[PDB]
């Protein structure tokens, strides 16, 4: 129902300012505010949003409060001043969801029949992209339970829009543009090796959760099947790529030919002007 999102950072800063509005007062749990959107294709876009007050006691996670009158009033405001927008969901600032969130979702899926949430983090350090998307559909179950209404993790990204970075890249000021040729590749090496194989090792920690625990949905439906998509390469010892060392030599082939020829021509670049201007400066210096 949702293909992916195209989410601008402006709405994230529009979360940040209301986070500032709640960091100064008695903060019980978190922020629940409105997420407007510009839904055009099965892809999604958001240009703007606003918040709504919210409190929640924790006794039966059912005591939680919005103001639909205020919501539809400021929706009428921003709909009049901009007829492109409409509501598309909500957001929350606490990075881990909880069981009240389905009640939030289905209670605001009455205006438009879809309401995608947005996890964010006001103090992000370890995550990748803040923007996250769920959708509430049913697969019902293998055991076909009475309405196993599940959030379904839709893919996400940070969006892009022309000249919205006019403030941004002027503000941050620290950007080393076009570090191709230096150390960006090894930053990606450190982070993708370590920070992806730790995702892998926490997947195998979840496998240890399946060992000592994990009766719950032990999930022999999607786990080993997408892991069989991984297991397209069962890379055991003896390494099994006698039929790929020549292909690796073919990979080395053209680039090393370019390296040999071209860097010989690069020495040929440097030496000419270097010698000529060198002895020019040297014996015409006096």
């Amino acid at each position: 129902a949702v293909q992916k999102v195209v989410v601008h950072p402006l709405v994230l800063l529009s979360v940040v300012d209301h986070f500032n509005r709640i960091g100064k007062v008695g903060n019980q749990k978190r922020v629940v505010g409105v997420l407007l959107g510009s839904w055009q294709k099965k892809v999604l876009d958001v240009s703007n949003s606003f918040a709504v007050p919210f409190d929640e006691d924790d006794k039966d996670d059912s005591v939680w409060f919005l103001d639909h009158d205020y919501l539809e009033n400021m929706y009428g405001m921003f709909k009049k001043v901009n007829a492109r927008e409409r509501i598309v969901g909500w957001y929350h600032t606490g990075p881990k969801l909880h069981k009240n969130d389905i009640a939030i979702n289905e209670l605001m899926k009455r205006y438009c029949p879809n309401s995608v949430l947005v996890i964010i983090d006001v103090k992000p350090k370890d995550l990748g992209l803040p923007t996250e998307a769920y959708i509430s559909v049913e697969e019902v179950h293998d055991d076909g339970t009475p309405t196993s209404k599940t959030f379904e993790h839709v893919t996400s990204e940070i969006g892009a829009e022309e000249a919205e970075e006019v403030g941004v890249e002027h503000l941050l000021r620290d950007i080393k543009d076009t570090t191709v040729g230096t150390l960006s590749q090894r930053i990606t090496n450190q982070v993708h090796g370590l920070k992806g194989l730790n995702s892998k090792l926490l997947d195998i920690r979840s496998y240890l959760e399946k060992v000592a625990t994990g009766k719950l949905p032990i999930n022999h439906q999607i786990i080993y099947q997408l892991q069989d998509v991984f297991n397209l390469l069962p890379d055991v010892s003896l390494q099994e790529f006698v039929k790929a060392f020549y292909l690796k030599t073919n990979d080395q082939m053209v680039v090393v030919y370019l390296a040999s020829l071209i860097r010989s021509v690069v020495a040929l670049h440097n030496l000419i002007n270097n010698k000529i201007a060198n002895r020019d400066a040297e014996k015409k210096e006096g």
Binding site: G181, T182, Q239, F241, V242, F245, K248, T249, D251, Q252
Partner: protein, 85 residues
């Protein structure tokens, strides 16, 4: 230095030689000396023959290790891009 070069230069470099060539070049025609040499190759003889087989195995290639380590040489090539400005 003749006999060690016999021990390096009449077997494990050829295909097979018969017993009489070893009888001519390796004198005294059956000591434990030419027997010492034939077993000193790391090889078991048959009757009236000396094969020089079971050598140069697997057709070795060194699969992808120079592809790795010469990029590890490209590492100090980038250091040569570093040391100059």
């Amino acid at each position: 230095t003749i006999r060690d070069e016999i021990a390096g230069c009449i077997e494990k470099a050829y295909e097979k030689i018969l017993f009489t060539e070893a009888t001519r070049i390796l004198f005294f025609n059956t000591p434990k000396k030419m027997t010492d040499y034939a077993k000193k190759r790391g090889w078991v003889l048959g009757p009236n023959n000396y094969y020089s087989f079971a050598s140069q195995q697997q057709k070795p290639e060194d699969t992808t290790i120079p592809s790795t380590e010469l990029a590890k040489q490209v590492i100090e090539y980038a250091r040569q891009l570093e040391m100059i400005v």
